Amino acid sequence: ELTQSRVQKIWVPVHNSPTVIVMVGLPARGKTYISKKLTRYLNWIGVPTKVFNVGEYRREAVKQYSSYNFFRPDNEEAMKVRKQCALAALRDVKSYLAKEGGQIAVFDATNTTRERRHMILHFAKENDFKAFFIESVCDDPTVVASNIMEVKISSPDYKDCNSAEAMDDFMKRISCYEASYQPLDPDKCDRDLSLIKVIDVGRRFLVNRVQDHIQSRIVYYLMNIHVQPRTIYLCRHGENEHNLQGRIGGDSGLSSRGKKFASALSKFVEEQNLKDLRVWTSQLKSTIQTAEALRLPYEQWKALNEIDAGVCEELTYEEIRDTYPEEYALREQDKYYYRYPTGESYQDLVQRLEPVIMELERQENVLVICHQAVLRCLLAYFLDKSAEEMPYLKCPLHTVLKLTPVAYGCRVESIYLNVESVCTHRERSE
Ligand SMILES: Cc1coc2ccc(-c3cc(Nc4cnccc4S(C)(=O)=O)cc4nccnc34)cc12
Ligand SMILES: O=P(O)(O)OC[C@H]1O[C@](O)(CO)[C@@H](O)[C@@H]1O
């Protein structure tokens, strides 16, 4: 005896264990880059995840950074402070996982000693949390130097000292950790832990005892990402006939303005002067027509097809409000989770866009020509926007969104190609 829920259209009867991810490694080995990127992916696929960076606890507890002397192993007092910052971060990890509905807590510190990791194990074991270790190993001076230049010298620790002095201070800071650093030893003393040791910026991996699906998924993700420079371009199909009529969904062709956009996109792409640009479309006509103007090879993906409005397909928003007034209201109230009847939600979109994201990570220069709701979902991933926000991100017609991975984030530049269109943006209601 069953009833269908109003928002998600789920039939209900009418009368999982959380994980602490423990980063491991010397400073400037990309621990925080990984922490952030992973946390972005996990949240976007609907696994609530949060980073606890001990460094930030240390920054909060102590006046202002003066020098690497603070990190000296003989600094008996800084050691007490560091350890207390760690325990405070863990206190917050407990609260996040046990009481705030967090699923994954990423404990982002050096955690270079067996003793420290042993304390974290004990903390996890006694709260029924699983523990999963990720160690980044790299002994290439160039990579380290570049890491320091790119994100360290610019940190708030170093505002009073810049450049040569910061670079110099950071190298000595690193050397403070070298003597007591005990790498993960899966061969022997760590043979029973679940871990991945990543070597040389993802060149090789050593993976030991994957316990569950999240961990195998993390490993798969780590095996697909890369740090080569590249650019990702996202846009919609040129304006189509249904856009002109205010009609949603469907498989209409480009308007005359849509075709002018396509010519302009072609011009824009040529002027970007890229090598080996891959082009991806949906299987819907308007995106394919748009790519046809480019005179480049392209590949279609059913996963990039626009959200399926179900019974509302090909209707105007007005027609939907007149015909299905309660469905209309429910969508405006809960736009991410709402499923159209016999159709999709934004939540469903994320599931089928996941392999698009994973292939995007593998690629270099890519242009993705897609549809409004799909574009928002992808944009949310790259820009770390939440589920509640995703459905309202702005992605105008005839506008290219040019994304450039930077460390810890993504530059976004909008480039409108000066071809008029209607506006299909609909802001949050009531
Ligand atoms: C790819 C990949 C898969 O697993 C990884 C683990 C670490 C890193 C990583 C990423 C990384 N990125 C990074 C770190 N700090 C500042 C800038 C960057 S970057 C290269 O601009 O994105 C630097 C690293 N340095 C030493 C070892 N690993 C680094 C990359 C990968
Ligand atoms: O989630 P929203 O704001 O209704 O936008 C998705 C709609 O946008 C369009 O791509 C253009 O109106 C429709 O095909 C689709 O139903």
Side-chain angles (χ1 to χ4, degrees), residues 1-62 64-430:
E1 236 297 271
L2 293 185
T3 194
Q4 194 171 34
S5 79
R6 12 165 113 252
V7 174
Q8 311 185 58
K9 308 300 187 288
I10 297 300
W11 294 99
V12 284
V14 292
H15 294 179
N16 60 135
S17 188
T19 292
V20 180
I21 291 185
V22 179
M23 303 303 297
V24 179
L26 293 175
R29 264 68 174 168
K31 294 187 302 296
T32 284
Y33 176 74
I34 298 309
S35 296
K36 284 180 183 293
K37 187 149 195 173
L38 220 41
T39 293
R40 200 150 50 76
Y41 168 78
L42 290 164
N43 281 310
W44 178 82
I45 64 163
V47 177
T49 296
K50 189 167 169 189
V51 180
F52 301 82
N53 177 292
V54 180
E56 275 160 31
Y57 284 71
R58 179 271 302 162
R59 253 197 295 282
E60 177 73 359
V62 138
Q64 157 74 51
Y65 181 76
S66 16
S67 80
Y68 78 88
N69 285 281
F70 182 87
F71 291 102
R72 273 160 63 171
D74 61 352
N75 191 331
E76 149 209 83
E77 164 161 281
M79 294 285 290
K80 274 153 176 261
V81 160
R82 288 169 60 197
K83 168 169 182 220
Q84 288 299 313
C85 282
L87 296 169
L90 289 178
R91 209 165 300 130
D92 290 341
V93 161
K94 165 156 163 150
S95 168
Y96 174 69
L97 299 180
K99 289 148 64 76
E100 287 160 35
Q103 202 84 240
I104 304 283
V106 182
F107 197 67
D108 174 17
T110 55
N111 303 309
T112 46
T113 71
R114 285 184 184 168
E115 158 264 312
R116 171 53 60 79
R117 292 193 301 262
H118 184 93
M119 159 199 68
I120 297 154
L121 265 333
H122 176 83
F123 162 92
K125 153 193 177 74
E126 96 194 330
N127 289 271
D128 286 311
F129 298 159
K130 288 185 257 213
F132 182 60
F133 296 82
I134 301 171
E135 185 180 13
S136 176
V137 179
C138 185
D139 304 298
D140 175 338
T142 308
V143 165
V144 172
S146 173
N147 297 156
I148 293 154
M149 293 314 303
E150 272 222 48
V151 304
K152 302 306 189 173
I153 68 187
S154 147
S155 151
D157 280 351
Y158 292 105
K159 76 177 217 343
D160 299 341
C161 358
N162 243 307
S163 255
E165 334 191 83
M167 160 63 80
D168 197 73
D169 182 81
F170 204 92
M171 291 307 288
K172 293 178 187 163
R173 190 169 163 170
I174 284 168
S175 72
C176 293
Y177 290 84
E178 261 150 4
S180 59
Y181 175 28
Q182 318 176 266
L184 293 177
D185 178 36
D187 283 358
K188 332 158 239 304
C189 277
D190 295 312
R191 90 183 82 82
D192 284 340
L193 307 184
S194 303
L195 62 97
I196 169 169
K197 212 168 159 94
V198 186
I199 288 137
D200 283 340
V201 203
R203 155 143 73 258
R204 11 188 321 193
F205 304 80
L206 194 179
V207 180
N208 187 63
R209 292 208 186 261
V210 185
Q211 304 170 259
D212 75 3
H213 54 108
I214 294 153
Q215 298 177 19
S216 75
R217 190 88 83 99
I218 288 164
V219 173
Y220 175 54
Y221 183 76
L222 295 175
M223 294 184 23
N224 289 302
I225 68 171
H226 69 78
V227 300
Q228 298 319 310
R230 49 96 152 246
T231 313
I232 290 159
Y233 303 88
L234 305 178
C235 72
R236 295 165 66 184
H237 51 90
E239 178 188 65
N240 67 40
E241 292 293 339
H242 267 37
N243 296 148
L244 290 176
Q245 298 167 351
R247 285 196 178 282
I248 76 177
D251 194 17
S252 67
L254 295 181
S255 77
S256 45
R257 285 144 138 202
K259 304 182 181 157
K260 277 180 160 80
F261 172 65
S263 301
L265 183 61
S266 194
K267 204 164 170 295
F268 176 80
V269 165
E270 204 189 311
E271 278 152 20
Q272 287 289 297
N273 204 26
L274 303 156
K275 222 76 174 357
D276 296 295
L277 177 65
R278 300 307 174 74
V279 182
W280 297 348
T281 72
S282 75
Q283 286 183 343
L284 300 177
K285 185 181 203 180
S286 55
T287 70
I288 292 156
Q289 285 184 283
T290 299
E292 276 292 320
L294 307 178
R295 292 315 189 80
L296 282 152
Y298 62 93
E299 304 112 68
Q300 313 186 12
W301 288 73
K302 193 172 193 289
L304 292 173
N305 281 8
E306 181 58 308
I307 199 182
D308 187 330
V311 296
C312 295
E313 276 279 308
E314 301 199 290
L315 264 39
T316 64
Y317 286 101
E318 284 158 73
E319 287 164 354
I320 294 159
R321 196 202 313 112
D322 297 334
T323 302
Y324 311 95
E326 193 199 325
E327 290 304 317
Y328 190 84
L330 287 167
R331 200 163 187 263
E332 304 203 306
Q333 281 151 30
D334 202 1
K335 199 186 190 203
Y336 177 83
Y337 291 105
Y338 173 88
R339 268 186 196 92
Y340 275 106
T342 79
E344 285 177 317
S345 64
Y346 275 79
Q347 180 178 44
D348 295 333
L349 266 185
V350 168
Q351 297 300 111
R352 59 174 168 95
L353 294 167
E354 198 279 340
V356 177
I357 287 312
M358 203 61 94
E359 189 57 37
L360 274 174
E361 295 290 347
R362 295 202 46 93
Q363 293 292 311
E364 279 178 24
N365 298 320
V366 187
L367 167 55
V368 180
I369 308 177
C370 56
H371 307 258
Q372 185 162 252
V374 162
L375 184 30
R376 287 169 175 155
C377 291
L378 297 172
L379 195 57
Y381 170 75
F382 287 108
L383 266 31
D384 193 33
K385 303 292 174 167
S386 72
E388 304 303 315
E389 289 177 294
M390 168 181 311
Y392 302 99
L393 297 176
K394 296 197 195 212
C395 324
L397 283 170
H398 297 176
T399 306
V400 179
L401 296 182
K402 180 193 170 167
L403 305 175
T404 305
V406 136
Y408 299 10
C410 204
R411 202 164 90 253
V412 49
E413 323 163 34
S414 180
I415 303 142
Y416 169 57
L417 292 196
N418 199 37
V419 184
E420 283 291 349
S421 71
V422 299
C423 194
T424 55
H425 198 263
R426 302 175 78 267
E427 320 220 284
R428 196 189 266 86
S429 253
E430 167 267 11

